[PDB]
mmCIF file of C-alpha atoms and ligand atoms in Angstrom:
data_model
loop_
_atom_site.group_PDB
_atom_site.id
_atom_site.type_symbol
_atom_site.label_atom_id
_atom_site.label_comp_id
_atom_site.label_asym_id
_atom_site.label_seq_id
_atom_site.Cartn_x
_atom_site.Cartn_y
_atom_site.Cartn_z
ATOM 1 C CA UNK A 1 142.962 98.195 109.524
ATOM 2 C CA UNK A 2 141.343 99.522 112.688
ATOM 3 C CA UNK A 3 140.444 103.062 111.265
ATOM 4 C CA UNK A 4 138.953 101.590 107.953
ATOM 5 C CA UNK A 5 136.727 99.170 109.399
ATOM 6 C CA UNK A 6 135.560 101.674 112.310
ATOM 7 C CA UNK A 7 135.001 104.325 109.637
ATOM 8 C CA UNK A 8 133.281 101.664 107.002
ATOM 9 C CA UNK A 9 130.315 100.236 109.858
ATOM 10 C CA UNK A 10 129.599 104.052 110.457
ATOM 11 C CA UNK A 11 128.728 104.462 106.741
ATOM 12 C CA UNK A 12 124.718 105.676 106.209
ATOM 13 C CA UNK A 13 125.298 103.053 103.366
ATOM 14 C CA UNK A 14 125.911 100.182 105.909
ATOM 15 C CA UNK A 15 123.740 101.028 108.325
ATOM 16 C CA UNK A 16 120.725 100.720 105.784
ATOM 17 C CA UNK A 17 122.659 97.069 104.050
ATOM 18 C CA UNK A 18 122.750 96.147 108.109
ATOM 19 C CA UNK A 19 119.895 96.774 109.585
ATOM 20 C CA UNK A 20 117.973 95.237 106.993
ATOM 21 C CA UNK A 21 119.784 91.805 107.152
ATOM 22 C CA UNK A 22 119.160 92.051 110.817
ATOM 23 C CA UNK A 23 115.619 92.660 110.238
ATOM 24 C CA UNK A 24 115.343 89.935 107.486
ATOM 25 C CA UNK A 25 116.190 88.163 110.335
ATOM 26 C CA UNK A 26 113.315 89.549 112.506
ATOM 27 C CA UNK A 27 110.677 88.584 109.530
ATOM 28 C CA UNK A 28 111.763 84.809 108.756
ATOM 29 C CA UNK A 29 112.527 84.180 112.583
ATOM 30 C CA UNK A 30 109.332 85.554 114.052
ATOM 31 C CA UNK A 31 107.558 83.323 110.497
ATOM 32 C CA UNK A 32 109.168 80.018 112.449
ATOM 33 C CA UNK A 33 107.798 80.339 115.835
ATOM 34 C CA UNK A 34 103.874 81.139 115.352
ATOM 35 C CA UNK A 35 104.165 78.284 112.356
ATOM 36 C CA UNK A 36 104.213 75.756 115.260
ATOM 37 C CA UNK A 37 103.085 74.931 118.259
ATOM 38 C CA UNK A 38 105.118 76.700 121.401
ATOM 39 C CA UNK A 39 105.067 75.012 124.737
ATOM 40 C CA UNK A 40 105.221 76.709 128.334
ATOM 41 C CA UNK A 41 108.496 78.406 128.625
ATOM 42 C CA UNK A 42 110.124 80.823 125.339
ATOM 43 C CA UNK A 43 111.904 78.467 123.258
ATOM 44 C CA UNK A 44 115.319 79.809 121.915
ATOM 45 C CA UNK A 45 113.698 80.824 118.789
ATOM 46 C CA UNK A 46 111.256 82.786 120.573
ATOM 47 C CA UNK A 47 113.717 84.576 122.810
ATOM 48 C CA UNK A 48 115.640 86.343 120.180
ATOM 49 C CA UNK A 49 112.748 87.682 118.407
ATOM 50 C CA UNK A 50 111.799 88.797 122.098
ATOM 51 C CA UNK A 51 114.774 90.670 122.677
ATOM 52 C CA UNK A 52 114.737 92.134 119.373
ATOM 53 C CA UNK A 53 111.927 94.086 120.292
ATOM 54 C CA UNK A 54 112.649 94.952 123.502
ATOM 55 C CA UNK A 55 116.387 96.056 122.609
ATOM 56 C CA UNK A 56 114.226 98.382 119.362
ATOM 57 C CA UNK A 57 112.561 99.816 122.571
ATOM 58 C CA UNK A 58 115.186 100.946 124.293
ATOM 59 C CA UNK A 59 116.672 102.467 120.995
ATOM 60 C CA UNK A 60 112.613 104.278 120.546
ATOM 61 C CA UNK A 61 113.880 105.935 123.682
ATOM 62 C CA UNK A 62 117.038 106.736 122.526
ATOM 63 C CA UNK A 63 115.078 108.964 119.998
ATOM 64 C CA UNK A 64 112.542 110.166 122.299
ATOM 65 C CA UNK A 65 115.263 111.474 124.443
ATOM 66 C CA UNK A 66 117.870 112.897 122.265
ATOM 67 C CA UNK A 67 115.907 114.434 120.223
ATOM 68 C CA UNK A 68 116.342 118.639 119.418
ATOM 69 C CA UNK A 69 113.350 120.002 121.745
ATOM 70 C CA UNK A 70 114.478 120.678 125.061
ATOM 71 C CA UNK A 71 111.147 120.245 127.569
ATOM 72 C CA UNK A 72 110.488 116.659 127.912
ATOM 73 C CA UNK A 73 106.681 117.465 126.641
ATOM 74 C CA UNK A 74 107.966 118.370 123.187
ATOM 75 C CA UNK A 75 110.819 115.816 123.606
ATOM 76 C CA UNK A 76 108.399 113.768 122.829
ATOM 77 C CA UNK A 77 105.633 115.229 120.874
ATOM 78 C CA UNK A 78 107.528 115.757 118.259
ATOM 79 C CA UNK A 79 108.685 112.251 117.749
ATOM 80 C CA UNK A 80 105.020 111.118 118.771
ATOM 81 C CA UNK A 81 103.935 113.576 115.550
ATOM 82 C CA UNK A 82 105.922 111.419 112.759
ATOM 83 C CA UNK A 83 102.925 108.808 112.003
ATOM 84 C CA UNK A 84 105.227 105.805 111.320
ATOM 85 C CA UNK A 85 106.622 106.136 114.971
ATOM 86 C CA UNK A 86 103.283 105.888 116.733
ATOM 87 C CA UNK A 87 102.372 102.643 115.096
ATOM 88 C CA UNK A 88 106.002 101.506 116.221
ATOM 89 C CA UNK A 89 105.121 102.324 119.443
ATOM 90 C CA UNK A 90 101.353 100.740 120.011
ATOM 91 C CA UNK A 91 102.788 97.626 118.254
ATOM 92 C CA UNK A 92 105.959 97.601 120.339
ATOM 93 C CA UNK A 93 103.042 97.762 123.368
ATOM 94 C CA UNK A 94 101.325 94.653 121.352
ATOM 95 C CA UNK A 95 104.130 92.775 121.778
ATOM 96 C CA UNK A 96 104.639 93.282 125.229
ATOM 97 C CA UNK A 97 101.233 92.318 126.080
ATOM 98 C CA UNK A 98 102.093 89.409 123.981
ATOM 99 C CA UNK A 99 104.400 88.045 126.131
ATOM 100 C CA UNK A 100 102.425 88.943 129.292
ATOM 101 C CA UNK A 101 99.798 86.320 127.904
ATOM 102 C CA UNK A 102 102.033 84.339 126.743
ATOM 103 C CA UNK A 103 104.017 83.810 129.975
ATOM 104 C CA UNK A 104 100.519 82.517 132.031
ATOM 105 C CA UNK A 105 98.795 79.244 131.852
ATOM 106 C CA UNK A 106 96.358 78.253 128.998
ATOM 107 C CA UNK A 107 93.886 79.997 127.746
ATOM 108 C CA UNK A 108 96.101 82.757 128.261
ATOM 109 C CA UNK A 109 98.749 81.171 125.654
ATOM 110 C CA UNK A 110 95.778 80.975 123.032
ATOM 111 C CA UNK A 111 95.863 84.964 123.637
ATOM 112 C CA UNK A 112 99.442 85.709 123.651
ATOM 113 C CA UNK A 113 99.511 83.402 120.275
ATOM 114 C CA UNK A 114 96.773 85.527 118.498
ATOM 115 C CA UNK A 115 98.660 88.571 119.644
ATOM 116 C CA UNK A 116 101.869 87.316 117.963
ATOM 117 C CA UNK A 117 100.017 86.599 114.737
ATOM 118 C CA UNK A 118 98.738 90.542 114.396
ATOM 119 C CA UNK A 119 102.124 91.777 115.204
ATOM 120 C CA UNK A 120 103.552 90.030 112.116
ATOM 121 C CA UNK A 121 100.893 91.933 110.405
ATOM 122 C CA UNK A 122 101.907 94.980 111.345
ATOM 123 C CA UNK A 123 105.766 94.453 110.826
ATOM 124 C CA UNK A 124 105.530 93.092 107.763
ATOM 125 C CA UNK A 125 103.424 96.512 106.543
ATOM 126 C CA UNK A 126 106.358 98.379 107.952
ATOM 127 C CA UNK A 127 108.865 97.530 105.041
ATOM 128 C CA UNK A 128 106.802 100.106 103.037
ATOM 129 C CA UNK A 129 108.820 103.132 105.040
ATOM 130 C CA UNK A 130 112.405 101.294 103.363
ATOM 131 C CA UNK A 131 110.654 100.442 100.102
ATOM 132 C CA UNK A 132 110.355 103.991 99.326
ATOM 133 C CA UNK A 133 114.090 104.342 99.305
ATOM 134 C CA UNK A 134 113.814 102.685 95.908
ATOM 135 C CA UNK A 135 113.436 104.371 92.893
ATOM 136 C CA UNK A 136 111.284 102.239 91.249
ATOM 137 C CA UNK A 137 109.177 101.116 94.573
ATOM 138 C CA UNK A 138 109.074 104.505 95.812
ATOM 139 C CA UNK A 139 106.170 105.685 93.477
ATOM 140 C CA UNK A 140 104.095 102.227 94.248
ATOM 141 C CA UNK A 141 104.493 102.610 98.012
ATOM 142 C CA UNK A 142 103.147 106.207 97.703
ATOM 143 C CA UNK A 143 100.236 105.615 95.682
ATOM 144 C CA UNK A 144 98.947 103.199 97.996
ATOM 145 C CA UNK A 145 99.100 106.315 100.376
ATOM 146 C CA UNK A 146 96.940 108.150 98.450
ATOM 147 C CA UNK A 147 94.782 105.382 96.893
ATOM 148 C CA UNK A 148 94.156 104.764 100.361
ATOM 149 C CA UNK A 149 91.597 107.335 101.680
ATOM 150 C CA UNK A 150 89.748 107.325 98.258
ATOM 151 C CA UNK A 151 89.494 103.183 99.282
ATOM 152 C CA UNK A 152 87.956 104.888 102.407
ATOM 153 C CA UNK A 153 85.025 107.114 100.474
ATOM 154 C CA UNK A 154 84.304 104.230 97.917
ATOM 155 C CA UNK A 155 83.428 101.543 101.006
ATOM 156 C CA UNK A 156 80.782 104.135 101.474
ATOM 157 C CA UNK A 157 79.215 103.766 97.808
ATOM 158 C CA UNK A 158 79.909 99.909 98.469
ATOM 159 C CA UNK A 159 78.275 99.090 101.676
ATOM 160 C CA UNK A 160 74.986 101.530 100.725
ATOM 161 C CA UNK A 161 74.701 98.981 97.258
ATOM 162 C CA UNK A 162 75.950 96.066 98.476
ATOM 163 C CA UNK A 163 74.964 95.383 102.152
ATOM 164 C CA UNK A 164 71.236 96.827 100.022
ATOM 165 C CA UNK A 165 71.268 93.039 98.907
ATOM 166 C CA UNK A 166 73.216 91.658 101.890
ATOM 167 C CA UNK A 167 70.307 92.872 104.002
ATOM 168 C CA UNK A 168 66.808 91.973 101.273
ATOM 169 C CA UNK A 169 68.467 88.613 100.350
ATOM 170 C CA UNK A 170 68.160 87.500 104.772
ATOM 171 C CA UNK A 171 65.019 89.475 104.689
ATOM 172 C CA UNK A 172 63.533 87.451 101.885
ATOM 173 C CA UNK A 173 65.449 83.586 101.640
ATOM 174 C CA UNK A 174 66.275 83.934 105.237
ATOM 175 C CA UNK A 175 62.801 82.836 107.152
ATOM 176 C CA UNK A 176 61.440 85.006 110.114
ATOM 177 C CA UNK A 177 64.540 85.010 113.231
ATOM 178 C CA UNK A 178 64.686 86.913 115.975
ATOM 179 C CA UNK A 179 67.952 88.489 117.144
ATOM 180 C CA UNK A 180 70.660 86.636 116.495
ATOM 181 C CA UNK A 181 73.624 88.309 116.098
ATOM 182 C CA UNK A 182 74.659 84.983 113.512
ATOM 183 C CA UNK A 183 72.624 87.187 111.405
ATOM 184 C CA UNK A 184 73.707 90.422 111.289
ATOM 185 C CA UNK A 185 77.193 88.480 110.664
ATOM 186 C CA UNK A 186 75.225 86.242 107.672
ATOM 187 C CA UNK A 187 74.224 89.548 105.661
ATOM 188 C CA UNK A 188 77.654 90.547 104.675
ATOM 189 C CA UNK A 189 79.513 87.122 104.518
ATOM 190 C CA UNK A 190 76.711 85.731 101.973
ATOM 191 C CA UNK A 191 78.013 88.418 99.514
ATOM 192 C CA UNK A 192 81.556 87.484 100.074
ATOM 193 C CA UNK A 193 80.149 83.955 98.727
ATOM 194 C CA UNK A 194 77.696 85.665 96.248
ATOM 195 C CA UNK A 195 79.725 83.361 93.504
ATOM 196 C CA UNK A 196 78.288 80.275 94.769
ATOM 197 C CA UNK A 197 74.352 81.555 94.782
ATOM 198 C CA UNK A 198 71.941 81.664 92.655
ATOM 199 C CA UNK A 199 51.968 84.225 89.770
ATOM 200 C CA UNK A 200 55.224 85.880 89.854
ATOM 201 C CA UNK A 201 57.615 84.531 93.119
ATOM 202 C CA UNK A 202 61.101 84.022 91.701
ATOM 203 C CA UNK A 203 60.338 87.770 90.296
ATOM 204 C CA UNK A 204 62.397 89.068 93.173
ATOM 205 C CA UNK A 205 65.195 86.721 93.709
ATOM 206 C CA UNK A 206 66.029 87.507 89.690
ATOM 207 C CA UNK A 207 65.603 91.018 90.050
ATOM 208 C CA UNK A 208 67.927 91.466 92.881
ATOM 209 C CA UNK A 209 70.941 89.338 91.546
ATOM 210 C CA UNK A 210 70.412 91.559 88.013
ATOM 211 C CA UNK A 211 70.763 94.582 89.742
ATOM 212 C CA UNK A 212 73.468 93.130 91.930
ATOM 213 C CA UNK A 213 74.748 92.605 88.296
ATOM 214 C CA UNK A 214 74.654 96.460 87.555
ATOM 215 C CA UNK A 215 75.767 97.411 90.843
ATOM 216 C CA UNK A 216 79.006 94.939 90.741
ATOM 217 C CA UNK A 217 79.819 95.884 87.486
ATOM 218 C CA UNK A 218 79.362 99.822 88.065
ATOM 219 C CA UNK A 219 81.011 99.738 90.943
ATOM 220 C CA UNK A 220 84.326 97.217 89.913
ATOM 221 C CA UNK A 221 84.638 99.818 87.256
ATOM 222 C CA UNK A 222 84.010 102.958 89.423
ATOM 223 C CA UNK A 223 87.323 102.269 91.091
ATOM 224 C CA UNK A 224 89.020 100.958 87.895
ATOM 225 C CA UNK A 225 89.204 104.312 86.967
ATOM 226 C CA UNK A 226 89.701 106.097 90.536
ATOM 227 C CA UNK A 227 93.125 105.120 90.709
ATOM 228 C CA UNK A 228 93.434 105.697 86.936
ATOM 229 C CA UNK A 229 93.836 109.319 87.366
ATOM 230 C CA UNK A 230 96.192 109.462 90.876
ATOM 231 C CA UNK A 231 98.261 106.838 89.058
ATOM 232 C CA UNK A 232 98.694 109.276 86.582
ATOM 233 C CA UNK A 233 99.849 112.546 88.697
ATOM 234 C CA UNK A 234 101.616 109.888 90.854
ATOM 235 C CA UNK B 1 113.075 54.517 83.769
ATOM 236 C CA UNK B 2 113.562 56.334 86.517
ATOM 237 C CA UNK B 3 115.426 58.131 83.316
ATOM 238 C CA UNK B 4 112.457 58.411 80.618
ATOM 239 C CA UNK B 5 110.259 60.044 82.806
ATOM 240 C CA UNK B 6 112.681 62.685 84.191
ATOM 241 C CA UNK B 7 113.682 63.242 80.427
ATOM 242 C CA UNK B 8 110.036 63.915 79.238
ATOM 243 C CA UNK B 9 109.080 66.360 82.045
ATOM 244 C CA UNK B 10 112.218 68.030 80.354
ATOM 245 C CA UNK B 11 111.172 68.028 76.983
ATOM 246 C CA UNK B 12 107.979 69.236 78.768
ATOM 247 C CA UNK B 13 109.343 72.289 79.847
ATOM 248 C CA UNK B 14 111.656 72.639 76.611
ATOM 249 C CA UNK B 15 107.912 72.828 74.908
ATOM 250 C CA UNK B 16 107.199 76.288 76.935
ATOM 251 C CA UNK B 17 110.510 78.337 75.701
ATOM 252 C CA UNK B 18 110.273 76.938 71.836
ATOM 253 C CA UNK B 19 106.670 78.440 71.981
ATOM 254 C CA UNK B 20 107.898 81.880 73.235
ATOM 255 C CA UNK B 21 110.690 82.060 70.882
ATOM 256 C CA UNK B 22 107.901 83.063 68.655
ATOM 257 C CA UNK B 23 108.012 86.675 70.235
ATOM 258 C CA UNK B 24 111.232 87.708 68.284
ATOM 259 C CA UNK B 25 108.895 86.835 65.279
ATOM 260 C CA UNK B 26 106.026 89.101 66.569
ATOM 261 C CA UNK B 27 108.247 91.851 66.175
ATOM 262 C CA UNK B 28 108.073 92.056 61.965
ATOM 263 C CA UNK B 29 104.765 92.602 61.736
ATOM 264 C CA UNK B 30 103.740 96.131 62.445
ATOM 265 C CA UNK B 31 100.325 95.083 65.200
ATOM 266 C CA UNK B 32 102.458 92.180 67.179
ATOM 267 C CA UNK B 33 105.445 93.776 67.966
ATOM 268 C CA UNK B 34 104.149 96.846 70.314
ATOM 269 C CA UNK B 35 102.185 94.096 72.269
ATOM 270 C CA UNK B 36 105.817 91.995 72.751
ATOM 271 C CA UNK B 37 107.812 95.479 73.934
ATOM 272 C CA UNK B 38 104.579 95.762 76.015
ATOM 273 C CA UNK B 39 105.374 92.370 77.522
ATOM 274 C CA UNK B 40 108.661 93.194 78.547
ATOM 275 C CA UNK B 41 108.052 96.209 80.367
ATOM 276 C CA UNK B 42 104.822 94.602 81.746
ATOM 277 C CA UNK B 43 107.392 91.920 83.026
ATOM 278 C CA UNK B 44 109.900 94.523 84.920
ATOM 279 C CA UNK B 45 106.456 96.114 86.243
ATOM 280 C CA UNK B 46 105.241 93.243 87.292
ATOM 281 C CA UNK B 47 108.140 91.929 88.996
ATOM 282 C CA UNK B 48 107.830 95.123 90.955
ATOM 283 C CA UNK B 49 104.299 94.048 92.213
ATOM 284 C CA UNK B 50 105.521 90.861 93.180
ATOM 285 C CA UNK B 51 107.857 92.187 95.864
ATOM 286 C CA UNK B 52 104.721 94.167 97.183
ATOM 287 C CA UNK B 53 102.362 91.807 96.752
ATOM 288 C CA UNK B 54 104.992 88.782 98.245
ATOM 289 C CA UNK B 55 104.931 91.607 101.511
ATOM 290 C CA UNK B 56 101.306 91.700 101.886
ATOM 291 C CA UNK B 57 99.625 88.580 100.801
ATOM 292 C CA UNK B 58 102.561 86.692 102.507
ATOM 293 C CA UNK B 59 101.524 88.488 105.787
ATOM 294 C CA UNK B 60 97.732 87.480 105.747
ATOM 295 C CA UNK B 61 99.321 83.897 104.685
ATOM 296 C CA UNK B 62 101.674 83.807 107.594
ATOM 297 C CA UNK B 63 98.670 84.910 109.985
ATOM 298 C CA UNK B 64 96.207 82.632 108.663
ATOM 299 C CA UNK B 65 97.791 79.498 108.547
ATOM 300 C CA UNK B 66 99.113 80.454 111.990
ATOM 301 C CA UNK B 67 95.615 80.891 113.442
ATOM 302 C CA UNK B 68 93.861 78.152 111.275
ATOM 303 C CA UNK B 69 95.831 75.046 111.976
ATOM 304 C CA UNK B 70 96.856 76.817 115.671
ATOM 305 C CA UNK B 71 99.241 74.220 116.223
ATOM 306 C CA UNK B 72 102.243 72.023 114.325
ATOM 307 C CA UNK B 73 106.017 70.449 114.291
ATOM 308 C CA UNK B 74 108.501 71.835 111.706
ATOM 309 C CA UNK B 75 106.999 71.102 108.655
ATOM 310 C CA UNK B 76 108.774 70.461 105.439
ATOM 311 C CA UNK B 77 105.713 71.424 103.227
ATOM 312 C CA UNK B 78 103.812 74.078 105.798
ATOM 313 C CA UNK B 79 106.015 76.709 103.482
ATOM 314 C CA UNK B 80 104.546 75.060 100.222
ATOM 315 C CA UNK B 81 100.476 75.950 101.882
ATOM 316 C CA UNK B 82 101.053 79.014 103.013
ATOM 317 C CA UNK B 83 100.924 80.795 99.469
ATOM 318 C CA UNK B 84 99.364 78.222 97.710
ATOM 319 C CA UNK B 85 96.684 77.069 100.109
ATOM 320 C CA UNK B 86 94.767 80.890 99.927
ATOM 321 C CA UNK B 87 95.237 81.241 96.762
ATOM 322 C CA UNK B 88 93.140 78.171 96.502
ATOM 323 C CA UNK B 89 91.299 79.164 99.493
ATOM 324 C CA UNK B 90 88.922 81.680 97.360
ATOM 325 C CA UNK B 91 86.074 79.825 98.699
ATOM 326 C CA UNK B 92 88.106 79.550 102.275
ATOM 327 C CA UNK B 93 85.847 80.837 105.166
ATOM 328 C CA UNK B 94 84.787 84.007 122.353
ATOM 329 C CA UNK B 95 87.130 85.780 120.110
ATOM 330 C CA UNK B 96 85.177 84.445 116.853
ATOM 331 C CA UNK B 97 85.687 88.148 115.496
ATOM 332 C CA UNK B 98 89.364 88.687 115.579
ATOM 333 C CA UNK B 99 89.475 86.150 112.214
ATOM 334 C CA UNK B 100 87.394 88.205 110.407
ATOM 335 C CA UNK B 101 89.356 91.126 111.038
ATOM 336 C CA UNK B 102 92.487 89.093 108.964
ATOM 337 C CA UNK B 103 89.804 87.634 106.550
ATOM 338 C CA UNK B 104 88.562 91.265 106.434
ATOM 339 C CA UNK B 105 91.854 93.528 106.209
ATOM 340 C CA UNK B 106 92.977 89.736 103.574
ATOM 341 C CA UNK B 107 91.402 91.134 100.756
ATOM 342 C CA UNK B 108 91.153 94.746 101.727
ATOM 343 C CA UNK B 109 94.841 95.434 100.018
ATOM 344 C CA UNK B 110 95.330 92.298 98.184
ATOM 345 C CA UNK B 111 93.074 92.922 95.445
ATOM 346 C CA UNK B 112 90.831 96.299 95.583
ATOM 347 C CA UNK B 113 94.756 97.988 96.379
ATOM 348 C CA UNK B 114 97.136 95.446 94.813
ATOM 349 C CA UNK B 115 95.241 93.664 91.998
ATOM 350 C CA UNK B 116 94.619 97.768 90.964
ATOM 351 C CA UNK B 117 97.676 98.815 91.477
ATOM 352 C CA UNK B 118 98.474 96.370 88.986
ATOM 353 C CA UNK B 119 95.886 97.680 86.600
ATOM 354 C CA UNK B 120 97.118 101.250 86.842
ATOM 355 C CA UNK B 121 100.985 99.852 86.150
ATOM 356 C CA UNK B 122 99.988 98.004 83.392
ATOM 357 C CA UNK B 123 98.016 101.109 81.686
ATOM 358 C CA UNK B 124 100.953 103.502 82.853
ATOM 359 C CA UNK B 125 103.417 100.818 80.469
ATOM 360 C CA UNK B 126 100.368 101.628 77.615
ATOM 361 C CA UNK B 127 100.878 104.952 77.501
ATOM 362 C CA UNK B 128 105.102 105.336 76.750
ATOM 363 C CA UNK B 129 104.804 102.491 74.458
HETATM 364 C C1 LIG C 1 111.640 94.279 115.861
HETATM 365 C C2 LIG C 1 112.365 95.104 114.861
HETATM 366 C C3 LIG C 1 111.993 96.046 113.985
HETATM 367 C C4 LIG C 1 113.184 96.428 113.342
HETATM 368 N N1 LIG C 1 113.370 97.399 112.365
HETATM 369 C C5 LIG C 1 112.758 98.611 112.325
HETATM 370 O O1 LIG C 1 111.728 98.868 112.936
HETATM 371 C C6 LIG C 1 113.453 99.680 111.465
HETATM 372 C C7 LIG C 1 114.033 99.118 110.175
HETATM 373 C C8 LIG C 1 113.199 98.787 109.117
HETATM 374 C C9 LIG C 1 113.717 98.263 107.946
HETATM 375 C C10 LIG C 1 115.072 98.066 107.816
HETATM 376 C C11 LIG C 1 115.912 98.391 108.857
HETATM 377 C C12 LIG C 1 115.397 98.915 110.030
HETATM 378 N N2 LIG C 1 114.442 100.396 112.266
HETATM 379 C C13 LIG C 1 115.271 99.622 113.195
HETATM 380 C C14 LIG C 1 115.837 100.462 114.329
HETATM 381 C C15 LIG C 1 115.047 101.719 114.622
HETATM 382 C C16 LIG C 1 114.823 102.489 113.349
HETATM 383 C C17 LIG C 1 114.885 103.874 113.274
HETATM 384 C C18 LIG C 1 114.680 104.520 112.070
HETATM 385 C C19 LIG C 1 114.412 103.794 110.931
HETATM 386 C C20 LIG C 1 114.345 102.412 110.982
HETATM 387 C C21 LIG C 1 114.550 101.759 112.193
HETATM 388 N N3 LIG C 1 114.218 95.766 113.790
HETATM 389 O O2 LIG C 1 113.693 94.903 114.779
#
C-alpha cells in the first residue's frame, strides 16, 4: 500500500490534477478576501493566500538554483530568459509589496488593497500557460499570442483616426481652457461614450460624426479580417 | 398558489425546448439543415470561449467590483454583480489613474481579442461545414 501510493503522487499526471486543485484554491480564496473589507491584522483567509505565495517563492528558487548551468550568472539567466517566469517573478515582488502596505496604518491599507486587486489580474492571465495543455484550448491560447502584437500595430491606425475626433470634438464643443490635465483625460473618454452623443454652423459637428462613421466602420472591419487570416494558419 | 405560479414559470421554460425541437425539422430541407449542424459545432466552440472569456472578463469583474465598492461583509448576492453588473455597466465609468488602467486593459481583451476570437471560431466552423 505504501509503494503504490508513493509511486501514484509522483505521477506527471497527478502533479498537473494537484496542483491545479491547489491553485483553484489560490483563485476562489484570494476572490473572498479583496470582495470585502479587511481590517488591521491578516485575517485567516488572508494568511493562506499569503503563504501560498511566499511558499511558490521559495519553490522559484528551487528552480533558479537547480537548474543545469553551473555559474550562478547563467543559473539564473536562463530561467530569467523563459518569459512566463519573469512575470512570476515581478508579480511575486507585487505581492510582497502588497503586504508591506498592507501591514501599516491607513492610507497605506488603501495601497496594499489596490495592489491585491492587480495581482488577481495577473494570476488569473496565468492559467493561459495550463490551458495550452488542452487540445482544443491550446490553438485559442496561441492565437491570442499572435493576435496580440498585430492588436499592437492597429492601436496605431486607431489612435491617429480616432483621438483625430477625440481631439477637434474638445477643440470645437469644448469652450476655450487652459491646461487642465481633466482635458487631455476628456479627449479620449468622450469617444469611449461616443454612443451617447450626438449660414452653415452645425456643418462641422455633422461632418465629423459622418466621418467618425467611415472611420468606425473601416476600422471595426480592418481587424475583422486581421485575425481572419492568422486564425486560419493558426 | 404558492403552486400555480411555480407551475407556470415551468411551463415557461417548457415553451423554450418545444420551440427548439423544431431543429430536428430544419434538417429535411436542403438550406436549414447546414445552419442547425452549424449550431452545434458553434455550441462546442463556443463553450470553448466561455472558459476563456469566464478567465478574463471574470478578472476585470473581480478587480472592479473590488476597487468600486472598496469595502463590504460577505455578501450573498456580491457573486450575482460581479458578472452581471459590467455587463450592464456598458455605460459604467491621487491615484485617479490606476482605474483607468483596469477600465483600459477591461476592454482591451474582452472584446477587440475575445469578442474576435469568437468571430474567427465561428468562420473557422463555416468553412468544414
Ligand atoms: C500563488 C500560486 C501560483 C500557483 N501556481 C502556479 O504559478 C503554477 C501552476 C499553474 C497552474 C496550475 C498549477 C500550477 N505552478 C505552481 C508551482 C510552480 C510551477 C512551476 C511550473 C509550472 C507551474 C507552476 N500556485 O500558487
Amino acid at each position: 500500500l505504501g509503494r503504490k501510493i508513493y509511486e501514484f503522487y509522483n505521477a506527471p499526471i497527478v502533479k498537473f490534477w494537484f496542483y491545479t486543485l491547489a491553485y483553484i484554491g489560490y483563485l476562489m480564496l484570494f476572490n473572498y478576501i479583496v470582495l470585502v473589507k479587511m481590517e488591521r491584522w491578516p485575517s485567516t483567509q488572508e494568511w493562506i493566500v499569503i503563504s501560498y505565495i511566499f511558499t511558490l517563492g521559495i519553490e522559484k528558487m528551487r528552480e533558479i538554483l537547480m537548474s543545469e548551468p553551473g555559474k550562478l550568472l547563467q543559473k539564473v539567466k536562463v530561467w530569467l530568459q523563459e518569459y512566463w517566469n519573469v512575470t512570476d517573478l515581478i508579480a511575486i515582488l507585487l505581492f510582497s509589496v502588497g503586504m508591506i502596505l498592507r501591514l501599516q496604518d491607513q492610507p497605506f491599507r488603501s495601497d496594499g488593497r489596490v495592489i491585491y486587486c492587480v495581482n488577481i489580474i495577473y494570476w488569473y492571465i496565468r492559467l493561459l500557460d495550463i490551458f495550452g495543455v488542452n487540445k482544443y484550448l491550446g490553438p485559442y491560447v496561441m492565437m491570442i499570442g499572435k493576435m496580440m502584437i498585430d492588436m499592437m500595430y492597429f492601436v496605431i491606425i486607431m489612435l491617429v483616426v480616432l483621438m483625430s475626433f477625440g481631439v477637434a470634438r474638445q477643440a470645437i464643443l469644448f469652450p476655450n481652457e487652459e491646461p487642465s490635465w481633466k482635458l487631455a483625460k476628456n479627449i479620449f473618454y468622450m469617444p469611449y461614450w461616443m454612443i451617447y452623443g450626438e449660414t452653415g454652423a452645425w456643418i462641422v459637428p455633422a461632418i465629423m460624426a459622418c466621418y467618425l462613421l467611415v472611420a468606425n466602420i473601416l476600422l471595426v472591419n480592418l481587424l475583422i479580417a486581421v485575425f481572419n487570416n492568422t486564425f486560419f494558419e493558426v
